[PDB]
């Protein structure tokens, strides 16, 4: 199964975080 990256880079952005694909799950983290 693939991660929902386009949903993640918006949802974490609405919190001031980088949306990161772990592999099938999303993470909200500092921008690199």
Experimental method: NMR
Asked if residues 7 and 26 have their Cβ atoms less than 8 Å apart, the reply is yes
Beta bridge partners of 28: 19
CA atoms within 13 A on the CB side of 14: 5
How many whole angstroms from its chain centre is CA 15? 11
CA distance 1 to 15: 26
How many whole angstroms from its chain centre is CA 13? 8
**DSSP structure string for 1-32:** ----HHHHHHHTGGGT-EEEE-SSSEEEE---
CA distance 25 to 32: 19
How many whole angstroms from its chain centre is CA 25? 8
Beta bridge partners of 18: 29
């Amino acid at each position: 199964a693939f991660c929902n990256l386009r949903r993640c880079e918006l949802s974490c952005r609405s919190l001031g975080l980088l949306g990161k694909c772990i592999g099938e799950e999303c993470k909200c983290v500092p921008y690199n």
